[PDB]
Amino acid sequence: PSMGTLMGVYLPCLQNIFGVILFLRLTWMVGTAGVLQALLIVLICCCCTLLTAISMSAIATNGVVPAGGSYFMISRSLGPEFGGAVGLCFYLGTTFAAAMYILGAIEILLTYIAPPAAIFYPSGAHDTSNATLNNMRVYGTIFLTFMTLVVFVGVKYVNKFASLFLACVIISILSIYAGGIKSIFDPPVFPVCMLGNRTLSRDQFDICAKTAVVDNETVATQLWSFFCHSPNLTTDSCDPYFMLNNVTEIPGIPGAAAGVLQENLWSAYLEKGDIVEKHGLPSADAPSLKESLPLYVVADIATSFTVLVGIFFPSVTGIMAGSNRSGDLRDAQKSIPVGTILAIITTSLVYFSSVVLFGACIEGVVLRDKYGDGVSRNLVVGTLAWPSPWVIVIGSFFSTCGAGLQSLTGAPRLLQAIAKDNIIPFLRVFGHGKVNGEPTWALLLTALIAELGILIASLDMVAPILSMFFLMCYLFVNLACAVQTLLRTPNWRPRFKYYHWALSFLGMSLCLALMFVSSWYYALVAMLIAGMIYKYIEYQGAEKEWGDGIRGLSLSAARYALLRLEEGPPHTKNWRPQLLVLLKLDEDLHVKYPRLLTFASQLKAGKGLTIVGSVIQGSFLESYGEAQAAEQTIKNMMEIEKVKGFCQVVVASKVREGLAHLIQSCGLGGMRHNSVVLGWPYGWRQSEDPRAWKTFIDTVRCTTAAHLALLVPKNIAFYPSNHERYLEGHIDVWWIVHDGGMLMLLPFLLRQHKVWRKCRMRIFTVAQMDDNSIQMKKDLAVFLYHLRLEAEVEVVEMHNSDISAYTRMHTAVKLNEVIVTRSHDARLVLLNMPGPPRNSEGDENYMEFLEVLTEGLERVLLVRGGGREVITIYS
């Protein structure tokens, strides 16, 4: 591990991000859309790329930066899914970028260097735009096969050629800028011929004039014959437009001044078939024939803001190239982000400055002319260069061929990596390699896809697909980062100093909008294939890890949610009850109190969680069938009571030991239960053995030991069935000094049912004789009215000296008289359960008085909190 930061990540990213659009389709961009819109487009693309770089840096800061490429980092940081989709998108982008590079190199070879090097000439104006496409296809396939053979046998020569090509691009840029600086003092002389208001083409004729002077006489020029098909100057059978307008010679490079910048500062789009047009030149109007149109210059494609953005976008892709040597950096956590960001910044600055230079040095005629038709078949960008345009042409050609080489040697690499990681089946056969490791069948697949792309044979028509794939990958990386940060995933801590999920969300939205505005059907199909591959990967993973069923990807979801649930710290406010239900089974293996199940169902109304549990005496090794039958019958009984939950039965030797074990064993980590529901012991005096009720008390102690809310309804046989409706009544809630957090909440949560909806609460808190409640009543009423739940509230009590719940037998009947006289007709009574016996011997007399505390009442529901259970909403 020994590599610098400039040599490790800066230079490779710089050479990858720079491309051929800068040398072929940037002056056209500035000319056809104006300086302001050009800067706007560059700014938008730079913004999405920079936000994606921020997200990539956040990814690269997390973890330990596993060695090997850039796909491995994303896969390790974002799970097995979100890696296959982005991997395939990147692969398709690389394999189409190779084809685009081949097409650009072929174009440079054909229209600039050696025009005679053509197979099928486009003879005649008829069917002009087919021979060029056929030549493109032929040369593309020949170059593709030759370069596949070149990258087959040897690769290290290509490896050093990479630095060669970077040097070529650098010298090209410096040449351009030196020429731009020289343009201040004295510009090069590259005249352009002008006819009326439109522009001619100088490649065919020689002199830009109507009539010339030869042999001491005035004679019509070659332009006269080529435009009027009449070698006699007296004929008038040609276009009236030529005889109605008059010719000039405009300097192709006027210099770098303010006026030239002001002239072409505004947008001027065009439609296919129109003529690139000057703005400030005088000209009359007249019709024209159809034979003269071939001897003009014409826009080859309809131009628009969206189309221009789509064409320009590939000129900024290549951000993720600064991770191919991730296993070699001396400092992985630091070098990658700063290097990537600096590379993006310097490319953006060069783009801005070059756009301004083109706007302020070349007029709107040359810039709006692809292929340099208006200027002697010459490259427009090379007109500015200092020594000569040929250095620019050679540098562009070498850089384009080299970029094709790296793309074609890089796509099989990640295809083989994805294949060897074994997440998609057929990639397994697509994965085999040579003895050293160089791919041997994936190269054929990428060659076939590159040939398919070349078959289109149009540089402008291929760039949008490249843009779609790269934008789609960027959308997934941004979305993954944003969601992972927001929803608290474990093992995701991007300790980067300038990261925020809002930035990732904003970049996602911005260049999602870019992806859709550019082309909606390509975006739609890309999204469909990405979603399909994501779901297929998820299904394969579920089949592999789990029992290989259609239920696997539900078990996976449950496990993933339960693992997410561990990161958060418990607990905040807004306490809600979660119920554990304890039942007793008759000697005939049948339930005893289904009304308790009905009550538990109507309290939660099908929300939250409920775990019904039971205990069967006996050994486990000889009573498995009994437990298996009891679980099934409890499951059947729960279905008819409209309660949704889970069941559990544990065979044990001691029933109280089984209950104690069930107290904290039910539920998984974080998915626990919050409260316990247990019944009342009926006829304990009838039974002679204390064990009929002592176990009861024991359970309470455990519920106090585990800090769990305890609910013990009494007279469950009188509780209403799930069918009997109620039309009128009053639910009394006798709040006392403590545990008021939920005593005012249970009526609110229970009101949301078809049974008790008609009733109204009658909270009747005690008014101790020590201090009156004139203002306390107002404060409590204000607190109730501030919350959603509100009802009649009063303050009344008979005595305060008696110490019942202060920290004591007469105080039981003393309050019982008031309760019975004031709440005899109430439908239901919420009441605070007292504390457990102080010592072990205090149990008996305990059971002595709680029942006379509820003697005479029909229905009571004793409640104790024994925990923290703070509440904020509603209550």
Ligand X SMILES: *[C@@H]1O[C@H](CO)[C@@H](O[C@@H]2O[C@H](CO)[C@@H](O)[C@H](O)[C@H]2NC(C)=O)[C@H](O)[C@H]1NC(C)=O
Angle at 654 between CA 653 and CA 657, to 5 degrees: 120
- CB neighbour list of residue 200: distance below 8 Å, 6 or more residues apart: 193, 194, 208, 223, 295, 296, 297, 374
Of a copy of itself, ligand X, K ion, none, which one does residue 157 interact with (CB within 5 to 8 Å by kind)?
none
The only residue of 8, 19, 412, 464 in contact with K ion, by rule CB under 5 A:
19
Q: Tell me which stretch binds K ion (CB under 5 A): 241-249, 312-320, 574-582, 670-678.
A: 312-320
Q: Which of 493, 559, 592, 786 binds a copy of itself (CB under 8 A)?
A: 559
CB-nearer residue toward K ion: 8 or 19: 19
CA distance 734 to 740: 10
Q: How far is the CB of 674 from a copy of itself (least distance, A)?
A: 9
Contact between 264 and ligand X (CB under 6 A)? no
Tokens of 521: 């059907």
Q: CB-wise, 285 or 817, nearer to ligand X?
A: 285
640-669: contacts with ligand X (CB under 6 A) = none
Return the residue of 300, 421, 460, 545 that touches a copy of itself, per CB under 8 A: 545
Q: Is 640 in the site for a copy of itself (CB under 8 A)?
A: no
* Angle CA 582–584–587, to nearest 5: 160
Whichever of 262 and 491 has its CB closer to ligand X, that residue is 262
| Residue 549, annotated as binding a ligand | no
**Is 296 marked as a binding-site residue?**
no
Residue among 287 and 437 whose Cβ is closer to ligand X = 287
What sign does the dihedral 122-127-129-132 (CA atoms) show? negative
* Span interacting with a copy of itself, options 252-260, 297-305, 322-330, 699-707, rule CB under 8 A: 699-707
Structure tokens that stand for 226 in this block: 């080529």
Q: Does 104 bind K ion (CB under 5 A)?
A: no
Please, are residues 179 and 386 in contact by the beta-carbon 8 Å criterion? yes
Question: Which has the closest alpha carbon to 583: 633, 619, 544, 511?
Answer: 633
Distance CA(50)–CA(346), nearest Å, equals 12
The label of the residue with tokens 């294939």 reads: 529
Q: Does 245 bind ligand X (CB under 6 A)?
A: yes
Query: How deeply is 873 buried, as exposed, middle or buried, from its count of CB atoms within 10 A (0-12, 13-18, 19+)?
Result: exposed
Where are the strands (E) in 536-645, listed by range? 579-582, 610-617
Residue type, 639: E
Least Cβ distance, residue 197 to ligand X (angstroms): 3
Q: Is 460 in the site for ligand X (CB under 6 A)?
A: no
Point out which residues pair with 211 in neighbouring strands.
220
The answer to whether 682 is annotated as binding is yes
Round to whole Å and give the CA distance between 475 and 631.
49
- Burial group, residue 1, by CB count within 10 angstroms (0-12, 13-18, 19+): exposed
First to last CA, the chain: 61
Task: Give the interface segment with ligand X, choosing from 84-92, 276-284, 388-396, 448-456 (CB under 6 A).
Answer: 276-284
Inter-residue contact 793 to 777 (CB < 8 Å):
yes
d(CA 450, CA 463): 13
Residue 301 assigned as binding residue: no
Q: Identify what 197 binds: ligand X, a copy of itself, K ion, none; CB under 5 to 8 Å per kind.
A: ligand X
By rule CB under 6 A, what string of x and - marks binding of each residue 277-306 to ligand X?
x-x--xxxx---------------------
**Residue from 121, 226, 620, 785 binding a copy of itself (CB under 8 A):** 620
Give the binding range for a copy of itself (CB under 8 A) out of 143-151, 289-297, 361-369, 605-613. 605-613
- 493 contacts a copy of itself (rule: CB under 8 A): no
Select 285 or 792, whichever has its Cβ closest to ligand X.
285
Among 565, 616, 655, 818, binds a copy of itself (CB under 8 A): 565
Answer for which of 318, 382, 439, 645 binds K ion (CB under 5 A) is: 318
Q: How far is the CB of 310 from a copy of itself (least distance, A)?
A: 16
**340 touches ligand X by CB under 6 A:** no
Query: Which residue, 218 or 872, is less far from a copy of itself as judged by CB?
Result: 872
Q: Which stretch binds a copy of itself (CB under 8 A): 210-218, 255-263, 539-547, 811-819?
A: 539-547
Which of ligand X, a copy of itself, K ion, none does residue 558 bind to, with CB < 5 to 8 Å depending on kind? a copy of itself
662 lines the binding site for a copy of itself (CB under 8 A): yes
| Residue 211 near ligand X by CB under 6 A | no
**Position 583 contacts a copy of itself (CB under 8 A):** no
Q: What does the alpha-carbon distance between residue 83 and residue 417 come to, in Å, rounded to a whole number?
A: 12
Q: What is the dihedral of CA 370, 372, 377, 382, to 10 degrees?
A: -120
19 binds, among ligand X, K ion, a copy of itself, none (CB under 5 to 8 A by kind): K ion
User: Minimum distance between the CB of residue 140 and K ion, rounded to whole angstroms?
Assistant: 19
Give SS3 for 594. helix
Count CA atoms within 13 Å of residue 718 on its CB side. Answer: 11
Indicate whether 246 belongs to the interface with ligand X (CB under 6 A).
yes
Interacting residue with a copy of itself among 184, 502, 671, 820 (CB under 8 A): 671
Positive/negative CA dihedral, 319, 325, 326, 332? negative
- Does position 792 interact with ligand X (CB under 6 A)? The reply is no
Task: Please report whether residue 650 would count as binding a copy of itself according to CB under 8 A.
Answer: yes
Site string for a copy of itself, 821-860 (x = CB under 8 A): ----------------------------------------
Count residues near ligand X (CB under 6 A). Answer: 10
Secondary structure in 3-state letters for 326-357: CCCCCCHHHHHHHHHHHHHHHHHHHHHHHHHH
Give the span between the Cα atoms of 142 and 687, in whole angstroms. 100
Among 530, 660, 784, 831, which residue sits at the site for a copy of itself (rule: CB under 8 A)?
660
Neighbouring C-alpha atoms within 13 Å toward the C-beta of 870: 5
Distance in Å, CB of 286 to ligand X, minimum: 8
CA gap 676, 864 in Å, rounded: 11
CB 21 → K ion: shortest distance, Å?
Answer: 7
Nearest to 202 by CA among 124, 291, 296: 296
DSSP string, 703-726: HHHTT-EEEEEE-GGGSPPSS---
Amino acid identity at 427: L
Q: Is 34 in the site for ligand X (CB under 6 A)?
A: no
Site size with a copy of itself, rule: CB under 8 A = 65
Residue whose CB is less far from a copy of itself, 568 or 856: 568
The DSSP letter of residue 588 is T
157 carries a ligand binding annotation: no
Which range touches a copy of itself (CB under 8 A), out of 220-228, 298-306, 346-354, 618-626? 618-626
Q: Is 584 among the annotated ligand-binding positions?
A: yes
* Contact call for residues 298 and 274 (beta carbons, < 8 A): yes
Question: With respect to a copy of itself, which residue has the nearer C-beta, 621 or 774?
Answer: 621
| Angle of helix 843-853 versus helix 810-823 axis, rounded to 10 | 20
**Smallest separation, CB 546 to a copy of itself (Å):** 6
| HEC per residue, 404-453 | HHHHHHHHHHHHHHHHHHCCCCCCCHHHCECCCCCECCHHHHHHHHHHHH
Judged by the rule CB under 5 A, the positions of this chain that interact with K ion are 19, 317-318
Judged by the rule CB under 8 A, the positions of this chain that interact with a copy of itself are 487-488, 516, 520, 524, 543-551, 554-555, 557-559, 561-565, 568, 571-576, 607-609, 611, 620-621, 624, 644, 646-648, 650, 652-653, 657-658, 660-671, 701-702, 705-706, 872-873
Judged by the rule CB under 6 A, the positions of this chain that interact with ligand X are 196-197, 245-246, 277, 279, 282-285
Binding region for ATP: 582, 584, 592-593, 615, 679-680, 682
Binding region for chloride: 318-320, 474
